[PDB]
Design an enzyme around this catalytic site. Structure first.
Site, short mmCIF file in Angstrom:
data_model
loop_
_atom_site.label_atom_id
_atom_site.label_comp_id
_atom_site.label_asym_id
_atom_site.label_seq_id
_atom_site.Cartn_x
_atom_site.Cartn_y
_atom_site.Cartn_z
CG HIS A 47 -1.73 1.20 1.40
ND1 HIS A 47 -1.45 2.13 2.36
CD2 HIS A 47 -2.81 1.65 0.74
CE1 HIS A 47 -2.36 3.08 2.33
NE2 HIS A 47 -3.18 2.83 1.33
CG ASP A 89 -6.43 4.66 0.52
OD1 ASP A 89 -5.20 4.37 0.73
OD2 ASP A 89 -6.89 5.81 0.57
#
Lengths: 121, 121
Positions: A47, A89
């Protein structure tokens, strides 16, 4: 933004994102880089890598529109840095959820383990 | 529970406890241990010491009854462990508010400082 990312992560995991993922392993949390300890940790690595690919928007502060529709994150967000942000996200939230089974609370204890060299994105 | 804790800390301090206290110094927030860096940090250490002394209930999970009467917490909780747990939480909330004078936003950033060996309760 953080707001949406925290929301998505809650939405997927069902877990308090703030306590689960504020600090976890070598990569979950603001200070933090290091070889992933585990799958969870790896989600945060992925991420963070994802954020790095972004240009023209701020992952931390910029808001974006997504919805939860049929209990899945839908990045309805036209603006394509924001769409990508949102998609970073959503990826991590799913990733974290997928990896709940191995989530280890001891990996909160930053002082109870050492971090190898960061993995390269 | 963390519900009641978080409410009380909010009640006392008036600060978002998530941004203020999820991660502060060596003791505030999950998986943090170390010599308290300042009074706020020490509040958190005393609070974990408080929890440490509890036998018979779960400081994280167990809901309990308190009221906010004349803007002070009242651990009206009858049941003796849950009221102790209430008093721990009530104490930290009060302690954090009291020590807002010296609260240092610097201590929110894990990699900005070191935690020495925890003191013992």
């Amino acid at each position: 933004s953080l707001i949406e990312l925290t929301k998505m992560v809650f939405q997927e995991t069902g877990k308090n994102p703030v306590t689960y993922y504020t600090l976890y392993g070598c990569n979950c949390g603001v200070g933090r880089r290091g070889k992933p300890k585990d799958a969870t940790d790896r989600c945060c690595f992925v991420h963070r890598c994802c954020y790095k690919k972004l240009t023209g928007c701020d992952p931390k502060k910029d808001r974006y529109s997504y919805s939860w529709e049929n209990k899945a994150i839908v990045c309805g967000e036209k603006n394509p840095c924001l769409k990508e942000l949102c998609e970073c996200d959503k990826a991590v939230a799913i990733c974290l959820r997928k990896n709940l089974g191995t989530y280890d609370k001891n990996y909160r204890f930053t002082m109870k383990f050492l971090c190898d060299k960061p993995e390269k994105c």
